[PDB]
């Protein structure tokens, strides 16, 4: 129901291959940063501090908390969930705006 985060889950080891690129492990846990041609997705692990980085969708899956199965959505409707935007529409907001606050709700 709620939204403003959205996750994903690594179901193969991917292998940085562009400049730019970043690496990932199977059967793992992060949360995309963003999404080009809803092909590709904007990686960001905390692991190490770097990212973020240009991942593939098939070697990544969107699901809700829960054990990990698959549901049947998909990530583009999660990208609508979380207004996820677009690598090209992030890369436009970065240097653009600076840190700030918004207000945030609360429920235990």
């Known amino acids: 129901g709620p939204l403003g985060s959205l996750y994903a889950i690594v179901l193969y080891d991917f292998k940085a291959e562009k400049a730019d690129e970043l690496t990932t492990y199977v059967g793992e846990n992060l949360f995309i940063c963003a999404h080009h041609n809803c092909e590709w997705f904007i990686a ?9 980085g240009l991942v593939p969708v098939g070697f990544v ?17 999660d990208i609508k969930s979380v207004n996820l935007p677009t690598v090209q529409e992030w890369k436009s907001n970065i240097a653009r705006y600076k840190a700030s606050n918004i207000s945030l709700g609360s429920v235990e």
């Open 44 to 52: 960001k692990p905390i692991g190490r501090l770097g990212g973020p």
């Open 61 to 77: 899956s969107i699901i809700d908390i829960a054990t990990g199965y698959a549901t049947g959505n998909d990530v583009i409707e």
